[PDB]
C-alpha cells in the first residue's frame, strides 16, 4: 500500500536554531503542528508558521504553497 514516500525538506526557523524536518507531500498541517510541539516542546494552537509575508496554519496547506521543495519558514506565536 503506497502512501507517497515523497518527503519534502522543511527548514524550521525558530528563536534558537534552524532545524530541518521531514514530512510527506500529502499530509495535513495539523499533523505537523502537533509534531513540532512534541519535538521542540513549545505550543500547538499558538504555534504559527510563516512563509515570508504569509501565515501558515491549519487553514491552508504547507505542501500546497508553504514548502514546495526545500524552503525556509519562520515560527511565531502571535
Amino acid at each position: 500500500a503506497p502512501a507517497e514516500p515523497k518527503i519534502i525538506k522543511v527548514t524550521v526557523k525558530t528563536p534558537k536554531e534552524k532545524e530541518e524536518f521531514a514530512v510527506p507531500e500529502n499530509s495535513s498541517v495539523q499533523q505537523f503542528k502537533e509534531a513540532i510541539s512534541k519535538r521542540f516542546k513549545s505550543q500547538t494552537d499558538q504555534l504559527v508558521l510563516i512563509f515570508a509575508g504569509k501565515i501558515l496554519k491549519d487553514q491552508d496547506t504547507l505542501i500546497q504553497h508553504g514548502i514546495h521543495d526545500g524552503l525556509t519558514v519562520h515560527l511565531v506565536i502571535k
Partner: protein
Amino acid sequence: KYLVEFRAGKMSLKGTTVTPDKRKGLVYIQQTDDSLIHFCWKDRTSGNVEDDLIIFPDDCEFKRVPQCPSGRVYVLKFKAGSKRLFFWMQEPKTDQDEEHCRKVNEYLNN
C-alpha cells in the same frame, strides 16, 4: 495610522526582468490588533492597496541597491524562500532616503 510612510514606486517582475512601475505609490507600515506588521503598497490615485504582506523579524532585510545610477532604488529581500521586492524613492530630496530605510528596517524587525 501608519508607522512609516514614504512615496515610492513598485516594480513588477515580468517574465524574468524587473520592470519598475511609473505610478505614484506610498509604502507604509501598518500594525493591526493581531500584533502583525503589515507592509502594504497603496496607490496614491485609487487609494486601493494592491500588495499587502505580513512582516516578521529574523527574516526581513531592506537595503539600497548599490548598482544603480540614481541610487534611490531600494530592495526588500526576505530571508525565507524567494522574495525580492524592488522599490524606488519618489520623495523630492534624498535627504531622508536612508532615514526612511532605517525606519523601515527598525519597525519591521522590531
